[PDB]
Amino acid sequence: MLKLKVEGMTCNHCVMAVTKALKKVPGVEKVEVSLEKGEALVEGTADPKALVQAVEEEGYKAEVLA
Numbered sequence: 001m002l003k004l005k006v007e008g009m010t011c012n013h014c015v016m017a018v019t020k021a022l023k024k025v026p027g028v029e030k031v032e033v034s035l036e037k038g039e040a041l042v043e044g045t046a047d048p049k050a051l052v053q054a055v056e057e058e059g060y061k062a063e064v065l066a
Helices: 019-023 048-057
Strands: 004-006 028-034 039-044 062-064
Touching: 004 048, 019 028, 019 039, 019 048, 048 062
Parallel strands: none
Antiparallel strands: 004 039, 004 062, 028 039
């Protein structure tokens, strides 16, 4: 399963929305993020690698806590 710990690789002095990054992956229809907990959850039928690669496309990797 997926549980993306969005790392603060850059702009760690600020915050950004990761939600728009997750939806771009096919099969994703719902998304939920917690800017305070540093986590990014989705609810779709996408592939495991497709999700974690999509956020890396924005330059923000995320440790699947699974």
